[PDB]
Ligand binder design. Structure first.
Ligand SMILES: *[C@@H]1O[C@H](CO)[C@@H](O)[C@H](O)[C@H]1NC(C)=O
Ligand SMILES: *[C@@H]1O[C@H](CO)[C@@H](O)[C@H](O)[C@H]1NC(C)=O
Ligand SMILES: *[C@@H]1O[C@H](CO)[C@@H](O)[C@H](O)[C@H]1NC(C)=O
Ligand SMILES: *[C@@H]1O[C@H](CO)[C@@H](O)[C@H](O)[C@H]1NC(C)=O
Ligand SMILES: *[C@@H]1O[C@H](CO)[C@@H](O)[C@H](O)[C@H]1NC(C)=O
Ligand SMILES: *[C@@H]1O[C@H](CO)[C@@H](O)[C@H](O)[C@H]1NC(C)=O
Ligand SMILES: *[C@@H]1O[C@H](CO)[C@@H](O)[C@H](O)[C@H]1NC(C)=O
Ligand SMILES: *[C@@H]1O[C@H](CO)[C@@H](O)[C@H](O)[C@H]1NC(C)=O
Length: 743
């Protein structure tokens, strides 16, 4: 329900005055309320205040890749009825594999539209706990499937697009569409590995790594995209739980990244964890108190509503702290149109007709088609047209709900690889074969019989929610169970053999890489509701592959070279380094790697520049139309991409940078720019524009300070160093962005 501002008990409170300042309306609502009532509404499952006609409002809604199940979400229980389903896009890991920022904005628009409709039905809030922008740093993380990948720059671009699409522009022009929430702020990328439970874990993070790896995405989300909400993390960073750290919430989130009057929710009773099990405060009241003074405005739990009155009476917090939090929450609601009449709000008109739109379904399909990565191919793909009888085998072959990952809703449909092969007209012999993770070989003979007479074999396997999930990290990053044994037995048949490696995290597929009998390999992640159709469109050649790995495929032994608790990224006395930036070993498949159905010849469309003076770049930063010096340009490369093959294809141009100047050691590579060139027909030459910022090229020192250093720099335009360029910066080392030193 919404408050009645025409006739309800608040119709003369300034909150119901539609032309008034939002913060003034929030202050008028808060000032008319009892301290005890305000404390009552410091939690996600807020009762409202019946005395003033303020209805209940639940802050906990989920929409990570489409409207999702949550305490605040209500799917209809009649399967064909209104609000019985919503568009279930692929997991953000495949979305990040697309490297298509525009597509991310479109997907965010669809999600916000459907969420608005559900809220108009009383089946969702106006306020969703998305996105997850913690880098998928360690390959074992059970929640990395929820993220765009392991590169902070890529995550930053992704999250800019997603926040602006979800909230409706860079500002509430009339209103917020929905209020997004970039979540788990501060060093959270671990579930329960080796008994290190997230709710008791202490992330020891250097200042350099905090500023260089763990927070740039929050820069983009909070400072550049103007998110209206941040969620503070379960864990501790350097001894202080996130939600009770005023250095993190005030100095970094609100001040450095400019959240301002935007509100901060805890993770779901992380305030409770500040007491138990973090043992940071010796009482629950003091846990609530220090979390509130640090900057946690609303508690995803009942701890605040049970303790904050005690905390005011014990002088641990003031009534004004509670009032400030409440003003933040209600100001956000005011900017959402909560206290405005629905007559002039188009977003208050969206209904069930606006959910599973033909265009939204096509968009989910397009996302899956651009995200799937072709890891290996010898020409077998796209499938020969004489291929007719196909055996589909594996614990993912007929995957329906598996394709949705976690944090999902109810989809209108789930098109499995099996069904999409049947939709395409193939004569299919299906066999489970074996489970995701078991020692039972009973199904092997059945799969062999399915494959014995076939024209081609499609094995679909990997990991899923039973292997990686919130609260469960992986111990091994190998294929689970005996899946590889069955793939080997199928390869013995020496037929055309295609292997679909699914799941969010990567598994060691090097054995498949080295086998001549495995003719093709694709990573399908969690591909969403139309995943099978996308995969089969790729297999048949109806759509050409173009997706690229958003994370590294590590060799299995990586799990023995570094513990998951090691928050450092640089190589060390005990670490081979983390991510493509620092890993000293040999990935099975590199970050950004991907194959196409055609060849590309790359050259310079404009002659690239050779030298820059640092003071000149800093001076010109003031005169480019950007809000902060780190957002101003270094340059824009123009690359010509000739389709030298015979098949129309997209191409993701990825610009990597390396340097030896400034702080040592330097990363091996950093992704500084990328762009998706669409629909290059055979013979044509398309031009890709690659814009690098001063912030992407500036180095972070031991203090978290980001500066421009004068030295020699190089750039290249694929993982295969497809063209290459050297330039040089000259002048004084000059600071581009400061860093608040830890309290
Ligand atoms: C809202 O307040 C302004 C002054 O702040 C006043 O001019 C206007 O009439 C008020 N509108 C309503 C609907 O009360
Ligand atoms: C706080 O909420 C509880 C549960 O709805 C209710 O019993 C109590 O009266 C509320 N307190 C005030 C001051 O409204
Ligand atoms: C929506 O939720 C309410 C309770 O929150 C429940 O009574 C109702 O049945 C739900 N809607 C449907 C269609 O089941
Ligand atoms: C909590 O920490 C205090 C010191 O900060 C210590 O004395 C106490 O034993 C700890 N209690 C628990 C339950 O961990
Ligand atoms: C509450 O916790 C903080 C930080 O642990 C501590 O400094 C403070 O003394 C505690 N308050 C009380 C009343 O014990
Ligand atoms: C494929 O999965 C669906 C569940 O979504 C099931 O109804 C169907 O029977 C399965 N097909 C086969 C051949 O197992
Ligand atoms: C395939 O797998 C599921 C296990 O989740 C099983 O219940 C199903 O009946 C199997 N299908 C066949 C045709 O044996
Ligand atoms: C597979 O199951 C076994 C037994 O439950 C377990 O020890 C192993 O960790 C599982 N594999 C994965 C990758 O989770």
């Amino acid at each position: 329900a919404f408050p009645d501002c025409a006739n309800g008990p608040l119709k003369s409170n300034l909150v119901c005055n539609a032309s008034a300042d939002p913060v003034s309306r929030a202050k008028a609502l808060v000032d008319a309320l009892t301290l005890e009532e305000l404390v009552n509404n410091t939690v996600n499952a807020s009762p409202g205040v019946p005395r003033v006609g303020l209805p209940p409002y639940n802050w906990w809604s989920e929409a990570l890749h489409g409207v999702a199940r949550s305490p605040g979400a209500n799917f209809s229980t009649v399967p064909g009825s209104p609000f019985s389903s919503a568009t279930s896009f692929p997991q953000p890991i495949i979305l990040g594999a697309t490297f298509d920022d525009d597509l991310i904005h479109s997907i965010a628009t669809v999600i916000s539209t459907e969420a608005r409709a559900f809220n108009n039905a009383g089946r969702a809030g106006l306020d969703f706990f998305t996105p997850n922008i913690n880098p998928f740093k360690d390959p074992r993380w059970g929640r990395g499937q929820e993220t765009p990948g392991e590169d902070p720059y890529h995550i930053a671009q992704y999250v800019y697009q997603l926040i602006t699409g979800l909230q409706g522009g860079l500002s509430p022009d009339p209103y917020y569409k929905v209020v997004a929430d970039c979540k788990h702020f501060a060093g959270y990328d671990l579930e329960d590995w080796h008994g290190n439970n997230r709710m008791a874990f202490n992330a020891v993070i250097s200042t350099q790594d905090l500023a260089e790896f763990y927070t740039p995405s929050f820069q983009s989300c909070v400072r550049d995209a103007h998110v209206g909400s941040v969620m503070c993390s379960y864990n501790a960073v350097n001894g202080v739980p996130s939600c009770a750290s005023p250095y993190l919430l005030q100095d970094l989130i609100r001040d450095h990244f400019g959240l301002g009057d935007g509100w901060i929710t805890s993770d779901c009773d992380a305030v409770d964890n500040v007491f138990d099990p973090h043992n940071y405060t010796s009482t629950l009241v003091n846990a609530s108190a220090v979390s509130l003074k640090a900057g946690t405005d609303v508690d995803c739990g009942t701890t605040y509503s049970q303790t904050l009155v005690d905390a005011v009476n014990q002088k641990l917090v003031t009534e004004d702290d509670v009032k400030t939090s409440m003003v933040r929450l209600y100001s956000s609601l005011v900017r959402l149109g909560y206290f405005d009449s629905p007559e002039n709000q188009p977003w208050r008109q969206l209904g069930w007709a606006d959910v599973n739109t033909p265009s939204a379904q096509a968009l989910a399909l397009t996302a899956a088609e651009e995200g799937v990565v072709l890891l290996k191919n010898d020409g077998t793909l796209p499938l020969s047209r004489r291929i007719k009888h196909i055996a589909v085998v594996g614990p993912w072959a007929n995957a329906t709900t598996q394709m949705q990952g976690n944090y999902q809703g109810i989809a209108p449909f789930l098109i499995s690889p099996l069904q999409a092969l049947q939709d395409a007209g193939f004569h299919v012999s299906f066999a489970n074969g074996t489970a995701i993770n078991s020692t039972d070989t009973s199904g092997f003979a059945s799969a062999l019989m399915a494959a014995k007479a076939a024209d081609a074999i499609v094995f679909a396997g990997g990991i899923d929610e039973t292997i990686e999930s919130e609260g469960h990290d992986r111990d091994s990053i190998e294929w689970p169970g005996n899946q590889l044994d069955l793939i080997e037995q199928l390869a013995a048949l020496r037929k055309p053999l295609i292997v679909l490696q699914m799941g969010g995290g990567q598994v060691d597929s090097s054995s498949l890489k080295a086998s001549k009998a495995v003719n093709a390999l694709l990573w399908g992640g969690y591909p969403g509701q139309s995943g099978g159709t996308a995969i089969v469109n790729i297999l048949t050649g109806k759509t050409a592959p173009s997706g690229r790995l958003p994370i590294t495929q590590y060799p299995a032994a990586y799990v023995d070279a570094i513990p998951m608790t090691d928050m450092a990224l640089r190589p060390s006395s005990s670490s081979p380094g983390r991510t493509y930036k620092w890993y000293t070993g040999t990935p099975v498949f590199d970050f950004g790697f991907g194959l196409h159905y055609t060849s590309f010849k790359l050259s310079w469309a404009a002659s690239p520049p050779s030298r820059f003076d640092i003071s000149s770049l800093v001076a010109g930063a003031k005169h480019a139309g950007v809000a902060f010096t780190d957002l101003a340009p270094l340059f824009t490369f123009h690359v010509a991409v000739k389709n030298s093959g015979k098949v129309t294809s997209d191409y993701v141009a990825l610009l990597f940078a390396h340097t030896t100047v400034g702080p040592s050691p330097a990363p091996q590579q950093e992704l500084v720019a990328y762009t998706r060139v669409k629909g290059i027909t055979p013979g044509r030459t398309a031009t890709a524009a690659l814009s690098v910022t001063l912030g992407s090229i500036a180095r972070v020192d031991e203090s978290g300070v980001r500066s421009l250093y004068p030295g020699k720099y190089s750039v290249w335009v694929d993982t295969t160093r497809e063209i290459m360029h050297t330039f040089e910066l000259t002048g004084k080392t000059t600071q581009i962005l400061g860093w608040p030193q830890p309290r």
